[PDB]
mmCIF file of C-alpha atoms in Angstrom:
data_model
loop_
_atom_site.group_PDB
_atom_site.id
_atom_site.type_symbol
_atom_site.label_atom_id
_atom_site.label_comp_id
_atom_site.label_asym_id
_atom_site.label_seq_id
_atom_site.Cartn_x
_atom_site.Cartn_y
_atom_site.Cartn_z
ATOM 1 C CA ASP A 6 98.314 26.426 368.675
ATOM 2 C CA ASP A 7 95.354 26.567 366.541
ATOM 3 C CA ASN A 8 95.016 30.054 366.570
ATOM 4 C CA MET A 9 98.540 30.125 364.867
ATOM 5 C CA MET A 10 98.029 28.516 361.557
ATOM 6 C CA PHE A 11 94.598 30.304 360.918
ATOM 7 C CA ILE A 12 96.536 34.027 360.805
ATOM 8 C CA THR A 13 98.641 33.013 358.342
ATOM 9 C CA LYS A 14 96.068 31.415 356.210
ATOM 10 C CA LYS A 15 93.608 34.357 356.223
ATOM 11 C CA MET A 16 96.883 36.343 355.166
ATOM 12 C CA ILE A 17 97.329 33.977 352.195
ATOM 13 C CA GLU A 18 93.875 34.154 350.974
ATOM 14 C CA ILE A 19 94.482 37.912 351.264
ATOM 15 C CA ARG A 20 97.464 37.793 348.963
ATOM 16 C CA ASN A 21 95.560 36.121 346.466
ATOM 17 C CA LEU A 22 92.732 39.006 346.437
ATOM 18 C CA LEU A 23 95.756 41.825 346.287
ATOM 19 C CA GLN A 24 96.839 39.746 343.236
ATOM 20 C CA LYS A 25 93.355 39.391 341.629
ATOM 21 C CA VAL A 26 92.090 42.810 342.256
ATOM 22 C CA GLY A 27 93.106 44.260 338.720
ATOM 23 C CA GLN A 28 95.449 45.593 336.211
ATOM 24 C CA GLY A 29 96.587 48.434 338.320
ATOM 25 C CA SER A 30 96.978 46.559 341.471
ATOM 26 C CA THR A 31 100.676 46.902 341.700
ATOM 27 C CA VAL A 32 100.080 46.364 345.427
ATOM 28 C CA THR A 33 100.505 43.019 347.513
ATOM 29 C CA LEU A 34 101.734 41.085 350.204
ATOM 30 C CA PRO A 35 105.092 39.097 350.637
ATOM 31 C CA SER A 36 105.760 35.345 350.169
ATOM 32 C CA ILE A 37 108.775 32.872 350.330
ATOM 33 C CA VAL A 38 111.012 32.969 346.924
ATOM 34 C CA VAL A 39 112.980 30.160 346.597
ATOM 35 C CA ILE A 40 116.478 30.280 344.584
ATOM 36 C CA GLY A 41 119.213 27.700 344.002
ATOM 37 C CA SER A 42 122.390 27.072 341.918
ATOM 38 C CA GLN A 43 122.453 24.239 339.621
ATOM 39 C CA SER A 44 123.620 21.592 342.107
ATOM 40 C CA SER A 45 121.816 24.034 344.733
ATOM 41 C CA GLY A 46 118.840 24.326 342.022
ATOM 42 C CA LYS A 47 118.384 20.548 342.104
ATOM 43 C CA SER A 48 118.648 20.506 345.725
ATOM 44 C CA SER A 49 115.971 23.207 346.347
ATOM 45 C CA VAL A 50 113.705 21.433 343.553
ATOM 46 C CA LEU A 51 114.145 18.266 345.869
ATOM 47 C CA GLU A 52 113.454 19.967 348.970
ATOM 48 C CA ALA A 53 110.326 21.933 347.743
ATOM 49 C CA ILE A 54 108.817 18.334 347.111
ATOM 50 C CA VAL A 55 110.109 16.914 350.244
ATOM 51 C CA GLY A 56 108.448 19.800 352.161
ATOM 52 C CA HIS A 57 105.320 18.619 351.602
ATOM 53 C CA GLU A 58 104.607 15.933 349.433
ATOM 54 C CA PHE A 59 106.157 14.473 346.074
ATOM 55 C CA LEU A 60 105.423 16.432 342.895
ATOM 56 C CA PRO A 61 106.543 16.693 339.380
ATOM 57 C CA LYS A 62 109.791 18.567 339.261
ATOM 58 C CA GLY A 63 113.370 19.076 337.573
ATOM 59 C CA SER A 64 114.151 16.941 335.040
ATOM 60 C CA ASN A 65 114.201 18.955 331.953
ATOM 61 C CA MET A 66 112.857 22.500 332.739
ATOM 62 C CA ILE A 67 113.041 25.611 330.908
ATOM 63 C CA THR A 68 112.364 27.018 334.398
ATOM 64 C CA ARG A 69 111.458 30.185 332.572
ATOM 65 C CA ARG A 70 107.938 30.584 334.625
ATOM 66 C CA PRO A 71 107.405 31.125 338.292
ATOM 67 C CA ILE A 72 105.317 28.607 339.942
ATOM 68 C CA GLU A 73 103.339 30.913 342.869
ATOM 69 C CA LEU A 74 102.467 27.540 345.423
ATOM 70 C CA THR A 75 100.083 28.570 347.905
ATOM 71 C CA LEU A 76 99.080 25.767 350.354
ATOM 72 C CA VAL A 77 96.067 25.332 352.635
ATOM 73 C CA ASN A 78 95.533 23.407 356.198
ATOM 74 C CA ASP A 79 93.723 20.343 355.032
ATOM 75 C CA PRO A 80 91.861 19.105 358.266
ATOM 76 C CA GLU A 81 88.820 17.396 357.438
ATOM 77 C CA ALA A 82 90.190 16.340 354.126
ATOM 78 C CA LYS A 83 91.602 12.616 353.701
ATOM 79 C CA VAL A 84 92.970 12.892 349.934
ATOM 80 C CA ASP A 85 96.204 14.585 348.965
ATOM 81 C CA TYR A 86 94.857 16.734 345.940
ATOM 82 C CA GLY A 87 96.222 19.433 344.221
ATOM 83 C CA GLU A 88 94.225 21.941 341.578
ATOM 84 C CA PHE A 89 94.929 24.763 339.229
ATOM 85 C CA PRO A 90 93.186 27.892 339.767
ATOM 86 C CA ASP A 91 93.366 28.604 336.030
ATOM 87 C CA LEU A 92 91.360 25.382 335.230
ATOM 88 C CA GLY A 93 88.701 25.971 337.715
ATOM 89 C CA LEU A 94 86.696 23.126 339.301
ATOM 90 C CA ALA A 95 89.567 20.615 338.375
ATOM 91 C CA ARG A 96 91.116 18.616 341.212
ATOM 92 C CA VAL A 97 93.932 16.198 340.401
ATOM 93 C CA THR A 98 94.105 12.812 343.007
ATOM 94 C CA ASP A 99 97.654 11.748 341.565
ATOM 95 C CA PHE A 100 100.800 13.773 341.057
ATOM 96 C CA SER A 101 101.495 12.042 338.160
ATOM 97 C CA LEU A 102 98.716 14.206 335.909
ATOM 98 C CA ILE A 103 100.131 17.134 337.809
ATOM 99 C CA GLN A 104 103.367 16.035 336.322
ATOM 100 C CA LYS A 105 102.181 16.000 332.719
ATOM 101 C CA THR A 106 100.466 19.225 333.062
ATOM 102 C CA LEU A 107 102.773 21.415 334.628
ATOM 103 C CA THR A 108 105.871 20.192 332.576
ATOM 104 C CA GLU A 109 103.518 20.546 329.516
ATOM 105 C CA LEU A 110 103.146 24.072 330.661
ATOM 106 C CA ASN A 111 106.904 23.998 331.220
ATOM 107 C CA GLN A 112 107.579 22.977 327.444
ATOM 108 C CA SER A 113 105.131 25.549 326.512
ATOM 109 C CA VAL A 114 107.060 28.304 328.097
ATOM 110 C CA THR A 121 104.245 36.357 328.754
ATOM 111 C CA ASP A 122 106.561 35.494 331.702
ATOM 112 C CA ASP A 123 103.329 34.915 333.808
ATOM 113 C CA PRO A 124 103.403 32.624 336.874
ATOM 114 C CA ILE A 125 101.034 29.746 337.096
ATOM 115 C CA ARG A 126 99.122 29.683 340.452
ATOM 116 C CA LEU A 127 98.947 26.510 342.281
ATOM 117 C CA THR A 128 96.830 25.245 345.042
ATOM 118 C CA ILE A 129 97.372 21.797 347.157
ATOM 119 C CA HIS A 130 95.752 20.476 349.933
ATOM 120 C CA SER A 131 97.152 17.882 352.387
ATOM 121 C CA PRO A 132 96.558 17.364 356.293
ATOM 122 C CA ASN A 133 100.434 16.917 356.454
ATOM 123 C CA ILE A 134 101.311 20.315 354.993
ATOM 124 C CA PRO A 135 101.041 23.396 356.754
ATOM 125 C CA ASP A 136 99.588 26.571 354.638
ATOM 126 C CA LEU A 137 102.231 28.358 353.447
ATOM 127 C CA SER A 138 102.949 30.674 350.129
ATOM 128 C CA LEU A 139 106.109 29.891 348.174
ATOM 129 C CA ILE A 140 107.105 30.694 344.641
ATOM 130 C CA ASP A 141 109.719 28.588 342.905
ATOM 131 C CA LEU A 142 111.442 30.785 339.543
ATOM 132 C CA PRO A 143 114.318 29.289 337.732
ATOM 133 C CA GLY A 144 117.725 28.547 339.402
ATOM 134 C CA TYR A 145 120.595 30.267 338.472
ATOM 135 C CA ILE A 146 123.142 28.146 335.732
ATOM 136 C CA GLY B 253 102.602 6.762 348.888
ATOM 137 C CA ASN B 254 103.271 8.078 352.282
ATOM 138 C CA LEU B 255 106.868 9.410 350.943
ATOM 139 C CA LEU B 256 106.575 12.198 353.473
ATOM 140 C CA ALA B 257 106.135 9.936 356.626
ATOM 141 C CA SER B 258 109.067 8.155 355.218
ATOM 142 C CA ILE B 259 111.369 11.213 354.590
ATOM 143 C CA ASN B 260 110.649 12.020 358.218
ATOM 144 C CA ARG B 261 111.453 8.824 359.486
ATOM 145 C CA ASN B 262 114.985 9.417 357.982
ATOM 146 C CA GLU B 263 115.642 12.475 359.295
ATOM 147 C CA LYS B 264 114.568 11.331 362.621
ATOM 148 C CA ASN B 265 116.967 8.212 362.348
ATOM 149 C CA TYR B 266 120.034 10.047 360.824
ATOM 150 C CA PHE B 267 121.174 12.306 363.209
ATOM 151 C CA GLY B 268 121.176 9.308 365.557
ATOM 152 C CA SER B 269 124.429 8.210 363.701
ATOM 153 C CA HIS B 270 126.071 11.738 365.114
ATOM 154 C CA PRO B 271 123.292 12.814 367.561
ATOM 155 C CA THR B 272 125.412 15.233 369.536
ATOM 156 C CA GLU B 273 127.024 17.075 366.610
ATOM 157 C CA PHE B 274 123.585 18.108 365.389
ATOM 158 C CA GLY B 275 120.475 17.278 367.533
ATOM 159 C CA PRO B 276 118.214 18.799 369.897
ATOM 160 C CA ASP B 277 119.687 21.950 371.773
ATOM 161 C CA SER B 278 122.750 21.609 369.930
ATOM 162 C CA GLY B 279 122.872 25.263 368.144
ATOM 163 C CA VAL B 280 122.533 24.114 364.565
ATOM 164 C CA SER B 281 119.102 23.076 363.831
ATOM 165 C CA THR B 282 117.798 20.548 361.560
ATOM 166 C CA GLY B 283 115.370 18.077 359.559
ATOM 167 C CA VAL B 284 112.238 19.562 357.910
ATOM 168 C CA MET B 285 109.672 20.046 361.104
ATOM 169 C CA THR B 286 111.524 22.663 362.449
ATOM 170 C CA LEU B 287 112.480 24.401 359.187
ATOM 171 C CA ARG B 288 108.594 24.337 358.790
ATOM 172 C CA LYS B 289 108.006 25.923 362.149
ATOM 173 C CA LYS B 290 110.114 28.642 361.410
ATOM 174 C CA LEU B 291 108.838 29.238 357.755
ATOM 175 C CA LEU B 292 105.623 29.679 359.645
ATOM 176 C CA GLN B 293 106.908 32.130 362.168
ATOM 177 C CA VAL B 294 108.891 34.602 359.553
ATOM 178 C CA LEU B 295 106.057 34.337 357.130
ATOM 179 C CA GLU B 296 103.514 35.554 360.005
ATOM 180 C CA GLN B 297 106.403 38.156 361.161
ATOM 181 C CA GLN B 298 107.104 39.723 357.849
ATOM 182 C CA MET B 299 103.285 39.733 356.488
ATOM 183 C CA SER B 300 102.138 41.322 359.711
ATOM 184 C CA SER B 301 104.756 44.042 359.445
ATOM 185 C CA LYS B 302 103.839 44.919 355.555
ATOM 186 C CA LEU B 303 100.015 44.572 356.672
ATOM 187 C CA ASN B 304 99.632 48.169 357.789
ATOM 188 C CA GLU B 305 101.478 49.639 354.816
ATOM 189 C CA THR B 306 99.683 47.327 352.361
ATOM 190 C CA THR B 307 96.409 48.145 353.862
ATOM 191 C CA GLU B 308 96.941 52.193 353.488
ATOM 192 C CA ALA B 309 97.820 51.410 349.537
ATOM 193 C CA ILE B 310 94.391 49.589 349.331
ATOM 194 C CA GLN B 311 92.692 52.457 350.990
ATOM 195 C CA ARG B 312 94.447 54.816 348.612
ATOM 196 C CA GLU B 313 93.233 52.900 345.334
ATOM 197 C CA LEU B 314 89.796 52.752 346.988
ATOM 198 C CA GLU B 315 89.733 56.540 347.216
ATOM 199 C CA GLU B 316 91.043 56.979 343.904
ATOM 200 C CA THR B 317 88.260 54.754 342.406
ATOM 201 C CA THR B 318 85.852 56.568 344.487
ATOM 202 C CA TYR B 319 86.933 59.762 343.522
ATOM 203 C CA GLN B 320 86.036 58.835 339.829
ATOM 204 C CA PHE B 321 82.608 57.631 341.178
ATOM 205 C CA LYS B 322 82.160 61.209 342.085
ATOM 206 C CA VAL B 323 83.419 62.899 338.923
ATOM 207 C CA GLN B 324 81.805 60.292 336.773
ATOM 208 C CA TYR B 325 78.102 59.718 337.655
ATOM 209 C CA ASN B 326 77.925 61.972 340.690
ATOM 210 C CA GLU B 327 78.240 59.129 342.895
ATOM 211 C CA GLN B 328 74.434 57.928 342.669
ATOM 212 C CA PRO B 329 74.094 53.947 343.108
ATOM 213 C CA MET B 330 73.190 51.885 339.996
ATOM 214 C CA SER B 331 72.320 48.315 339.867
ATOM 215 C CA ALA B 332 71.025 46.235 337.053
ATOM 216 C CA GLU B 333 67.848 45.621 338.149
ATOM 217 C CA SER B 334 67.512 49.373 338.715
ATOM 218 C CA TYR B 335 68.542 49.997 335.035
ATOM 219 C CA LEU B 336 66.019 47.145 333.962
ATOM 220 C CA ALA B 337 63.115 48.446 336.047
ATOM 221 C CA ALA B 338 63.377 52.208 334.977
ATOM 222 C CA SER B 339 63.667 51.381 331.061
ATOM 223 C CA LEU B 340 60.687 49.158 331.276
ATOM 224 C CA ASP B 341 58.727 51.399 333.202
ATOM 225 C CA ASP B 342 59.608 53.900 330.345
ATOM 226 C CA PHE B 343 58.742 51.517 327.749
ATOM 227 C CA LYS B 344 55.269 50.882 329.306
ATOM 228 C CA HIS B 345 54.449 54.392 329.462
ATOM 229 C CA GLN B 346 55.611 54.723 325.952
ATOM 230 C CA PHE B 347 53.322 51.750 324.693
ATOM 231 C CA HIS B 348 50.363 52.751 326.509
ATOM 232 C CA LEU C 597 67.202 100.039 347.329
ATOM 233 C CA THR C 598 69.171 102.072 349.141
ATOM 234 C CA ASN C 599 66.564 102.388 352.039
ATOM 235 C CA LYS C 600 66.808 98.989 352.994
ATOM 236 C CA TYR C 601 66.498 99.314 356.746
ATOM 237 C CA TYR C 602 63.500 101.782 355.862
ATOM 238 C CA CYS C 603 61.526 99.246 354.225
ATOM 239 C CA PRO C 604 61.783 96.019 355.979
ATOM 240 C CA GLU C 605 58.763 94.429 354.374
ATOM 241 C CA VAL C 606 60.555 94.970 350.585
ATOM 242 C CA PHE C 607 64.001 93.866 351.660
ATOM 243 C CA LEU C 608 62.689 90.519 353.626
ATOM 244 C CA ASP C 609 60.321 89.700 350.854
ATOM 245 C CA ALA C 610 63.256 90.008 348.176
ATOM 246 C CA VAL C 611 65.460 87.630 350.625
ATOM 247 C CA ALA C 612 62.567 85.258 350.847
ATOM 248 C CA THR C 613 62.144 84.837 346.849
ATOM 249 C CA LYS C 614 65.833 84.271 346.373
ATOM 250 C CA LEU C 615 66.582 81.730 348.989
ATOM 251 C CA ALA C 616 63.580 79.802 347.643
ATOM 252 C CA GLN C 617 64.311 80.308 343.953
ATOM 253 C CA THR C 618 68.008 78.963 344.737
ATOM 254 C CA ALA C 619 67.029 76.528 346.837
ATOM 255 C CA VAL C 620 64.244 75.227 344.683
ATOM 256 C CA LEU C 621 66.951 74.464 341.842
ATOM 257 C CA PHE C 622 68.845 72.145 343.963
ATOM 258 C CA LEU C 623 65.530 70.664 345.545
ATOM 259 C CA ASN C 624 64.423 69.575 341.811
ATOM 260 C CA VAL C 625 67.609 68.223 340.754
ATOM 261 C CA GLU C 626 68.252 66.470 343.528
ATOM 262 C CA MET C 627 65.092 65.367 345.074
ATOM 263 C CA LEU C 628 62.496 65.421 341.859
ATOM 264 C CA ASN C 629 64.346 63.940 339.202
ATOM 265 C CA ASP C 630 65.220 60.880 341.892
ATOM 266 C CA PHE C 631 61.604 60.530 342.589
ATOM 267 C CA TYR C 632 60.959 60.275 338.902
ATOM 268 C CA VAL C 633 63.630 57.485 338.098
ATOM 269 C CA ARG C 634 62.998 55.598 341.611
ATOM 270 C CA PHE C 635 59.208 55.912 341.795
ATOM 271 C CA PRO C 636 58.570 53.330 338.905
ATOM 272 C CA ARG C 637 61.059 50.829 339.621
ATOM 273 C CA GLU C 638 59.956 50.570 343.260
ATOM 274 C CA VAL C 639 56.429 50.628 342.288
ATOM 275 C CA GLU C 640 56.898 47.565 339.856
ATOM 276 C CA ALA C 641 59.017 45.363 342.462
ATOM 277 C CA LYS C 642 56.868 46.169 345.555
ATOM 278 C CA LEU C 643 53.403 45.401 343.773
ATOM 279 C CA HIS C 644 54.845 42.270 342.310
ATOM 280 C CA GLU C 645 56.549 41.330 345.570
ATOM 281 C CA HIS C 646 53.476 41.754 347.328
ATOM 282 C CA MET D 299 24.092 4.904 340.476
ATOM 283 C CA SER D 300 25.064 4.062 337.008
ATOM 284 C CA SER D 301 21.187 4.146 336.010
ATOM 285 C CA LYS D 302 21.101 7.960 337.045
ATOM 286 C CA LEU D 303 24.352 8.841 335.471
ATOM 287 C CA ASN D 304 22.687 9.812 332.394
ATOM 288 C CA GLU D 305 19.864 12.043 333.738
ATOM 289 C CA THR D 306 22.334 13.965 336.405
ATOM 290 C CA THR D 307 25.166 13.884 333.380
ATOM 291 C CA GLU D 308 22.609 15.856 331.244
ATOM 292 C CA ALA D 309 21.548 18.156 334.382
ATOM 293 C CA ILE D 310 25.299 19.006 334.543
ATOM 294 C CA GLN D 311 25.410 20.135 331.071
ATOM 295 C CA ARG D 312 22.448 22.301 331.130
ATOM 296 C CA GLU D 313 23.760 24.110 334.291
ATOM 297 C CA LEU D 314 26.988 24.671 332.510
ATOM 298 C CA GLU D 315 24.947 25.731 329.332
ATOM 299 C CA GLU D 316 23.598 28.382 331.604
ATOM 300 C CA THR D 317 26.563 29.627 333.118
ATOM 301 C CA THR D 318 28.263 29.833 329.627
ATOM 302 C CA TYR D 319 25.461 32.229 328.209
ATOM 303 C CA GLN D 320 25.573 34.284 331.508
ATOM 304 C CA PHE D 321 29.211 34.314 330.471
ATOM 305 C CA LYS D 322 28.011 35.401 326.977
ATOM 306 C CA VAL D 323 25.411 38.293 327.893
ATOM 307 C CA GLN D 324 28.107 39.375 330.945
ATOM 308 C CA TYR D 325 31.602 40.090 329.412
ATOM 309 C CA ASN D 326 31.159 38.729 325.926
ATOM 310 C CA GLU D 327 32.966 35.750 326.861
ATOM 311 C CA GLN D 328 36.090 37.280 327.039
ATOM 312 C CA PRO D 329 38.924 35.815 329.109
ATOM 313 C CA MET D 330 40.171 37.185 332.618
ATOM 314 C CA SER D 331 42.955 36.322 334.747
ATOM 315 C CA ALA D 332 43.794 38.213 337.934
ATOM 316 C CA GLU D 333 47.411 38.941 336.421
ATOM 317 C CA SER D 334 45.523 40.339 333.267
ATOM 318 C CA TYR D 335 43.641 42.390 335.326
ATOM 319 C CA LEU D 336 46.471 43.598 337.735
ATOM 320 C CA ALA D 337 48.929 44.492 334.645
ATOM 321 C CA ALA D 338 46.273 46.211 332.847
ATOM 322 C CA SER D 339 45.304 48.877 335.742
ATOM 323 C CA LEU D 340 49.144 49.113 336.669
ATOM 324 C CA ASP D 341 49.805 50.462 333.134
ATOM 325 C CA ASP D 342 47.022 52.839 333.445
ATOM 326 C CA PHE D 343 48.715 54.150 336.418
ATOM 327 C CA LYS D 344 51.914 54.500 334.890
ATOM 328 C CA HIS D 345 50.791 56.444 331.946
ATOM 329 C CA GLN D 346 48.775 58.607 334.582
ATOM 330 C CA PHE D 347 51.874 58.998 336.894
ATOM 331 C CA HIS D 348 54.187 59.798 333.901
#
């Protein structure tokens, strides 16, 4: 069901390009938005981590900025690596460094949502965004 | 590491305590893999639905950019190499 | 000018002159200047590449 | 071979002298590469065309 993942991946690449066309590129493709109450919010963060692999989450979070998670089918790659689009050409092996970096962005706090890209053979390519949960 | 597999082993194993209450073909659905499959399904369906309208919008923004290319510069194409070549030809004639 | 059908020579020559001049303006702009601008770049690129 | 090295070397220097003098009478010993020739003729053509 190879034909199946692919359509989605091409579409996510397209979502990224509409996002990147310009200032007036109001236009875009949808994606999953995740919302959860505080007990529910904690559950949700745990769930997002559990869905693919463990990642820095929860603890003390301003939750001020959304996180656009874009996933890629990772056949032919044997190492769980996640990278940041803005800091291009930078790959992170251990998610502890991802924890320190993105939590430093959490303490920094525009309202712009950081984009993320993570490649793992276990993970099916997706396009979820996690905004702060209700308190 | 390999937390993924582990969270998968527990999900496989836990429903065993009460398999009939929530297990295959039971009305309810649970565990991470079926959820993921459904997420894939819905994402594909909804994205596919918005595809035509988003496509039309892209064509609209392309048309407006093109019209501005008509009003400004009369739609004559230009590359950096064309600009440099023309200016170099001018300078060589002037210098001679 | 009122005897246009009586003087086909003069009329046909006038139409020829007019069509020639208005066609000539657009011809000069669209084609001639395009030649003056593209020709040096094309010569240099093609000669160096050759 | 070592013995003839002196006389042969002198003869080569002689023919080099003659070739050099002809370079003096013809072309006034000014240097020339093919690229210098091509660009000079191209600039001539460009001024002519403009």
